[PDB]
Amino acid sequence: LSVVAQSKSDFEISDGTPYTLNVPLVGAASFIGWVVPTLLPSQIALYGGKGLSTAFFASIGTNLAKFPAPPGMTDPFWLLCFIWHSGLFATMILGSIGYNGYAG
Amino acid sequence: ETLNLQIPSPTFEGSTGGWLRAAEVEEKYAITWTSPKEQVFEMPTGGAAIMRQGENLLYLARKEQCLALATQVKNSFKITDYKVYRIFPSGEVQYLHPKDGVFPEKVNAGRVGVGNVSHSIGKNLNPAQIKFTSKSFNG
Amino acid sequence: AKSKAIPFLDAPPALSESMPGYVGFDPLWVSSMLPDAGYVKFLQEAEIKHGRVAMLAAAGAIVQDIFTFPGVKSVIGDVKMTSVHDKFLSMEAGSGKGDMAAMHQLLLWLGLLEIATSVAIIQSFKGETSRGPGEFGFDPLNFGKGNSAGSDSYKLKEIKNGRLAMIGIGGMVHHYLLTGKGPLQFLGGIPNYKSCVSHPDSLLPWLFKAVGPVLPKIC
Amino acid sequence: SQFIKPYNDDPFVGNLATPVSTSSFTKSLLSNLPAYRAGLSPLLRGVEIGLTHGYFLVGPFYKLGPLRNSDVALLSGFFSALGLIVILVACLTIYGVVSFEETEAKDQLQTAKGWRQFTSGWLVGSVGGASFAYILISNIPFLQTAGMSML
Amino acid sequence: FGGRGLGVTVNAERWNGRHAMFGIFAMVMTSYMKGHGLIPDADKVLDIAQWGPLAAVWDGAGNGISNERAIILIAHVHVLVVSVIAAIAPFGFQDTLVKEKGYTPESPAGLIPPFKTGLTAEAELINGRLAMLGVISIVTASLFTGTSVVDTINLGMGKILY
Amino acid sequence: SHSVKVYDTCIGCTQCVRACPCDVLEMVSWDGCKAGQIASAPRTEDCIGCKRCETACPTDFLSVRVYLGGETTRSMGLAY
Amino acid sequence: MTAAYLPSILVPIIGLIFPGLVMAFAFIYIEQDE
Amino acid sequence: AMSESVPFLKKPEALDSSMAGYAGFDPLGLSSIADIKFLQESEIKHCRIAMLAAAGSIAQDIFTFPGVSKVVGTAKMTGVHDVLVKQGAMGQILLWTSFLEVFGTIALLETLDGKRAPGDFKFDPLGFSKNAETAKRYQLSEIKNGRLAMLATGGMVHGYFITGKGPLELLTNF
Numbered sequence A: 001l002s003v004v005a006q007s008k009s010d011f012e013i014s015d016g017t018p019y020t021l022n023v024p025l026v027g028a029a030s031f032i033g034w035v036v037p038t039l040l041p042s043q044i045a046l047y048g049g050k051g052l053s054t055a056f057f058a059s060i061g062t063n064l065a066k067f068p069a070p071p072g073m074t075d076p077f078w079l080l081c082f083i084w085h086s087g088l089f090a091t092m093i094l095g096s097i098g099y100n101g102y103a104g
Numbered sequence B: 001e002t003l004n005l006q007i008p009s010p011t012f013e014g015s016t017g018g019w020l021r022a023a024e025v026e027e028k029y030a031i032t033w034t035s036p037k038e039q040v041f042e043m044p045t046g047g048a049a050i051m052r053q054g055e056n057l058l059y060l061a062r063k064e065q066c067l068a069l070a071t072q073v074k075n076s077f078k079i080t081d082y083k084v085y086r087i088f089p090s091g092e093v094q095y096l097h098p099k100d101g102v103f104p105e106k107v108n109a110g111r112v113g114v115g116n117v118s119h120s121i122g123k124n125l126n127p128a129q130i131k132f133t134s135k136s137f138n139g
Numbered sequence C: 001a002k003s004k005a006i007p008f009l010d011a012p013p014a015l016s017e018s019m020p021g022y023v024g025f026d027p028l029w030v031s032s033m034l035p036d037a038g039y040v041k042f043l044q045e046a047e048i049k050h051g052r053v054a055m056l057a058a059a060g061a062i063v064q065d066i067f068t069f070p071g072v073k074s075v076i077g078d079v080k081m082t083s084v085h086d087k088f089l090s091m092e093a094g095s096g097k098g099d100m101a102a103m104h105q106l107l108l109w110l111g112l113l114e115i116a117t118s119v120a121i122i123q124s125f126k127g128e129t130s131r132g133p134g135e136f137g138f139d140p141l142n143f144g145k146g147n148s149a150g151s152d153s154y155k156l157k158e159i160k161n162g163r164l165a166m167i168g169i170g171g172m173v174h175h176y177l178l179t180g181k182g183p184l185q186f187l188g189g190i191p192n193y194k195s196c197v198s199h200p201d202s203l204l205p206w207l208f209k210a211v212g213p214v215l216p217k218i219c
Numbered sequence D: 001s002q003f004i005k006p007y008n009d010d011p012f013v014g015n016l017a018t019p020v021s022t023s024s025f026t027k028s029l030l031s032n033l034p035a036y037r038a039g040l041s042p043l044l045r046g047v048e049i050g051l052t053h054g055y056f057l058v059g060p061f062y063k064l065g066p067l068r069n070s071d072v073a074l075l076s077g078f079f080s081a082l083g084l085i086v087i088l089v090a091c092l093t094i095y096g097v098v099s100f101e102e103t104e105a106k107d108q109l110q111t112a113k114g115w116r117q118f119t120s121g122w123l124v125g126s127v128g129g130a131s132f133a134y135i136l137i138s139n140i141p142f143l144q145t146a147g148m149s150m151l
Numbered sequence E: 001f002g003g004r005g006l007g008v009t010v011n012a013e014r015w016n017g018r019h020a021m022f023g024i025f026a027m028v029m030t031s032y033m034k035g036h037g038l039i040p041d042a043d044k045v046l047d048i049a050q051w052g053p054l055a056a057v058w059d060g061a062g063n064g065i066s067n068e069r070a071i072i073l074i075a076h077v078h079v080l081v082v083s084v085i086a087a088i089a090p091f092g093f094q095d096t097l098v099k100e101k102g103y104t105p106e107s108p109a110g111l112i113p114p115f116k117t118g119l120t121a122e123a124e125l126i127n128g129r130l131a132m133l134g135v136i137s138i139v140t141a142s143l144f145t146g147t148s149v150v151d152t153i154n155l156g157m158g159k160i161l162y
Numbered sequence F: 001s002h003s004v005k006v007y008d009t010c011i012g013c014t015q016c017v018r019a020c021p022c023d024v025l026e027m028v029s030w031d032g033c034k035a036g037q038i039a040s041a042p043r044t045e046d047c048i049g050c051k052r053c054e055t056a057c058p059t060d061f062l063s064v065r066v067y068l069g070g071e072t073t074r075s076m077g078l079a080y
Numbered sequence G: 001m002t003a004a005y006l007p008s009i010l011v012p013i014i015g016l017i018f019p020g021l022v023m024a025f026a027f028i029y030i031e032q033d034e
Numbered sequence H: 001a002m003s004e005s006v007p008f009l010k011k012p013e014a015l016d017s018s019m020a021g022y023a024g025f026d027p028l029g030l031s032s033i034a035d036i037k038f039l040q041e042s043e044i045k046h047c048r049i050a051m052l053a054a055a056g057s058i059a060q061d062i063f064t065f066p067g068v069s070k071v072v073g074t075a076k077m078t079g080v081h082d083v084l085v086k087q088g089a090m091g092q093i094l095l096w097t098s099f100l101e102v103f104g105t106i107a108l109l110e111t112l113d114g115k116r117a118p119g120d121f122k123f124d125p126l127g128f129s130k131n132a133e134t135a136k137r138y139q140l141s142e143i144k145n146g147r148l149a150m151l152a153t154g155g156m157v158h159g160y161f162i163t164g165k166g167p168l169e170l171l172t173n174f
């Protein structure tokens, strides 16, 4: 949140050009936009009957219970999180492009 | 005659190929020229710039860069109105080219010959003859 | 320039003389080690901070001998000074295995206070603030008669008691290291090493290894 | 909108104004680092840089040095880090001798007196930061392992 | 270069003298300390497994450095680290190993600098010159007589040490 | 700097002067040859040593000769 | 070996301190204007 | 000027006296890192959720809704959440709170634009704030109660994590 959708601090993406990074709006919208389709369930062993977002959230909970121990190589945590983060980064990138550039 | 520092530079978006700290502490070269058009040329240090109609001015690090650009403007845009200067960090500006108003490939009166040797190249002195002697090998 | 504390020696250059607690005693010129203007203020704050902790520490050791709060004796046992810090740490999580958190809780609350004071030290050092060293404004019962900073007479008393406490608490800790008696018991035993009360070894035990081989090791 | 521009309005200088180079966030970091922070003497700049560098130096020597599996690993890690610091201080000293001529001014790093102050600060800070890292690692079992004490 | 106070200078004379006076004191102390057996576990040879191959000394048996020599070396390390810090970052009032180069050199002492009873630069030079001579004397006596330096210090001092 | 010499076999073709990238050479008047002109080297402090002048020269052995000498910033071609 | 302490004294000095000092002073000599 | 809360520290520049709940307490200067209007709305949103949570914990110990006991027999606070996630009671709440937060995002944008005051959704059905002098007290009281509720909620849930009985039961039998 270097700059939010407001004229607070004089932020400049570069030497002399101010540019409003819309970190609240883009981060929130990208998060929700990616999560709602991702909820789609699937009776696949990786998901376990949940969606990707719900399974990823469940994987954080099950590995946080064994807090010092990390998830193992065959643990579904590593696959679920990587796919979820890759989609989130892609929808954040596309969201930043759409909102900052098209402005509407 | 002296460089008018206020001449507008050709439009350019910047590059990493420009001059470095040695230009601001040892010497810089400047070139001016007149363009009849607002046209794109190639910078010696990088990409493309646009010379403005009227008088242009650039700053480069090497004399060869100013002359490579001069060769280019003359060959393509037929601009023979280019003057090359050397600038020292003391503010002293030294006119360089063309040194007496006439291009070097054209003869001019009042030019004194430097480096001219009265015999042919095969008539030089052997190194042994001038060993432990200050005498020059050019006869 | 001649110092009052040491008449022959040249007066410390950096020290103002208008500062509280100044008798001219800075032979090693620690005040001049950093050229920055705020550094002398940093030194003054440190002295008071070292003094204030020491003052509490001195009283605390004495009071711990005089009496203990209800129930403490049962858990810790008969450990007396630094040994109680070690015992508590053994029974706290992270440091050890147990159901106690006395040392960790003290550190958490003291740490929150110290982060705020740290910002104050930085601001005073760079000259942003007009606050003098140690002036945190804590005078709930009026004593300075309208200023928490206090009069020069009182601040002299604070600085000198703090210096005295630093020496005294150091003595008490060191005396517990060999006799294991604690402040009051050691005072009662003017001839000591004749009788030594056993003390569990400190968390830093390598330092107490050159007693027997190089030193006499009377204890 | 365009994010890349000539450096300090000069199209013919050998630099560009890119977000990594000249953003507000980048400007804030560079300006607040001890090397560039305003209001710092050259000695204090040396002290802050020295504390940082000496502190991290101890760790690689201790964990990966020849005596890593011995019970004297931390002492070896401190001595090797200190040895490196002594060599680095000599590198700073010789650089100061050749690079700067003697002048009255002492408030700037790029002066002979100022560089000497930076070296004095860096030496003390590196010894102090390496010493602090030594005390912390000696006493806390989490730091001795990679956090592996919890497993 | 050599205009920084190095070479044969009153500055070098004083600094070497200061080290020699300390060295005489240290040799007296080490002779007394070892004589009373106050160096812990001196006979033991340091193990290569614990302390690395640096410990190896390649003598006929054991092939490892003794604990005593290691302890004495560590004392010298302690003072040497102080020395490096003092040279690079000296105290404000302290004399400096290297001089500014625009410094005015102090006059050479000559055969005998003027006698000053109080602590003074004169007394420091007189004692420092004497101590440097003493270090040479003790080493040469140990070489020619064939005894250890520790014994020579004891014998010169009348066995007071031990 | 580099040392540049012009020998009296120069036919005054001006080719060395046109080929020089650093404006070291120029043409002066001379009665020796048919063209009435000879090459000259008044600005050898700017000579980078490229030897494009020698490449341009058509006399059987070069009338213009470059002798590489002490290096400077100008003759090393350093823009830094 | 007789005088067996000598290699462990001289090899670090010859191998580390001697080159470190000749490099330091050679660097000073080759980078001085006068 | 000095901070009123921390006397030794300088007054935080980003903060102002007009803002409700202002005591000068920003020792770490986090107001510089992010816009104050965003933080102000964030604080009130946390305050309102925390206030509801603390009241809920007390109410849940005092009484339960009809038939709730059959689904959850022994679970007291965090425990009822897991069984009611499968019952879909928590699922339904999540859906409707998320639905309100969608319009919350538009409100947050209006705040950042500067037209909208932080934390104002114009929900005053009973006209409590009509006088405009009672309004200042109400705005302050809301901020203060919410701050206490954040501390209270965390304090209560942690008490449950140790002694699993809830806040009122802990008070009765320690």
Ligand code: CLA
Pocket (backbone or CB within 6 Å): A025, A026, A029, A030, A033, A086, A087, A088, A090, A091, A092, A094, A095, A096, A097, A098, A099, A102, A103, A104
């Ligand atoms: C992954 C999610 C996603 C996708 C696919 C799109 C796609 C699109 N957006 Mg949207 N947008 C998103 C998230 C996304 N957006 C979010 C989160 C926000 C809010 C912050 C917005 C806000 C926004 C605005 C305000 C506007 C758009 C517009 C557009 C269109 C053209 C501009 C553009 O971004 O080019 C993207 C071009 C493409 C996607 C097509 C190219 C095809 C290649 C293969 C791209 C693939 C990229 C990547 C691999 C796909 C990942 C999918 C998934 C795995 C994550 C395009 C249909 C503009 C438009 O046209 O209006 C309707 C417009 O005005 N978007």
Ligand code: CLA
Pocket (backbone or CB within 6 Å): C053, C054, C056, C057, C059, C060, C061, C063, C064, C067, C068, C069, C072, C076, C080, C084, C085, C088, C102, C138
């Ligand atoms: C450096 C100071 C210091 C340290 C590290 C300790 C640490 C400890 N003490 Mg000791 N103690 C201290 C000072 C200190 N005390 C002082 C100043 C007193 C009173 C004169 C005591 C009296 C005391 C007793 C009687 C007992 C302990 C005990 C203990 C142990 C358990 C914690 C506890 O119950 O403390 C409780 C301590 C207190 C409640 C005293 C707090 C007095 C405060 C600090 C002074 C007033 C502060 C001031 C008014 C406002 C400060 C804030 C201001 C700066 C803004 C622990 C190892 C217990 C123990 O294990 O016995 C062996 C125990 O029974 N302490």
Ligand SMILES: CC1=C(C#C/C(C)=C/C=C/C(C)=C/C=C/C=C(C)/C=C/C=C(\C)C#CC2=C(C)C[C@@H](O)CC2(C)C)C(C)(C)C[C@H](O)C1
Pocket (backbone or CB within 6 Å): C054, C055, C056, C058, C059, C138, C139, C140, C141, C142, C143, C161, C162, C164, C165, C166, C167, C168, C169, C170, C171, C172, C175, C182, C183, C184, C186, C187
């Ligand atoms: C500031 C402020 C406030 C406050 C406050 C407070 C809590 C003030 C606390 C002040 C205290 C505790 C001062 C104590 C200093 C101790 C000294 C000088 C003793 C050192 C020991 C020596 C010399 C010794 C020794 C010994 C040796 C080594 C051997 C041992 O075996 C034994 C022996 C003991 C003989 C209040 C709230 C009032 C408000 C006010 O508006 C402002």
Ligand SMILES: CC1=C(C#C/C(C)=C/C=C/C(C)=C/C=C/C=C(C)/C=C/C=C(\C)C#CC2=C(C)C[C@@H](O)CC2(C)C)C(C)(C)C[C@H](O)C1
Pocket (backbone or CB within 6 Å): H051, H052, H054, H055, H123, H124, H125, H126, H127, H128, H145, H146, H148, H149, H151, H152, H153, H154, H155, H156, H159, H160, H166, H167, H168, H170, H171
């Ligand atoms: C605004 C709006 C509307 C509305 C509305 C609403 C829903 C208003 C609701 C407001 C609420 C619910 C406020 C609740 C605050 C609770 C607090 C501060 C907690 C205190 C607990 C403590 C300190 C404790 C504790 C404990 C700790 C931590 C550990 C425990 O083990 C034990 C223990 C118990 C000791 C209406 C409809 C009225 C109209 C109006 O026109 C506009």
Ligand SMILES: CC1=C(C#C/C(C)=C/C=C/C(C)=C/C=C/C=C(C)/C=C/C=C(C)/C=C/C2=C(C)CCCC2(C)C)C(C)(C)C[C@H](O)C1
Pocket (backbone or CB within 6 Å): C082, C083, C085, C086, C166, C167, C169, C170, C171, C173, C202, C203, C204
């Ligand atoms: C908690 C914990 C620990 C702990 C601990 C603590 C608290 C350790 C305490 C350490 C202290 C305070 C030592 C004091 C040293 C003071 C000395 C040597 C003399 C100073 C004054 C002088 C020289 C005066 C000089 C002079 C005088 C005479 C007057 C003239 C002028 C002047 C030159 C000023 C452990 C380590 C046990 C670990 C364990 O896990 C538990």
Ligand SMILES: CC1=C(C#C/C(C)=C/C=C/C(C)=C/C=C\C=C(C)\C=C\C=C(C)\C=C\C2=C(C)CCCC2(C)C)C(C)(C)C[C@H](O)C1
Pocket (backbone or CB within 6 Å): H077, H078, H079, H081, H150, H151, H153, H154, H155, H157
């Ligand atoms: C600054 C300052 C001070 C202070 C102070 C301090 C240190 C205050 C500390 C406040 C803290 C640390 C609150 C912590 C947590 C709040 C929580 C956990 C709410 C949790 C909800 C949960 C856990 C639900 C979780 C869950 C649910 C049901 C679903 C299942 C899973 C599960 C995880 C169990 C003072 C005291 C000096 C005063 C001074 O004037 C100002």
Ligand SMILES: CC1=CCCC(C)(C)[C@H]1/C=C/C(C)=C/C=C/C(C)=C/C=C/C=C(C)/C=C/C=C(C)/C=C/C1=C(C)CCCC1(C)C
Pocket (backbone or CB within 6 Å): D051, D052, D053, D055, D056, D124, D127, D128, D129, D131, D132, D135
């Ligand atoms: C985290 C992270 C996340 C995002 C990306 C990222 C930014 C790249 C990355 C950062 C990574 C990096 C690079 C993090 C780097 C972190 C580093 C190197 C931190 C260094 C800290 C130094 C300390 C605490 C020194 C203390 C010395 C003291 C207290 C003095 C002690 C002494 C003195 C003199 C006084 C007397 C006593 C003694 C003990 C002698």
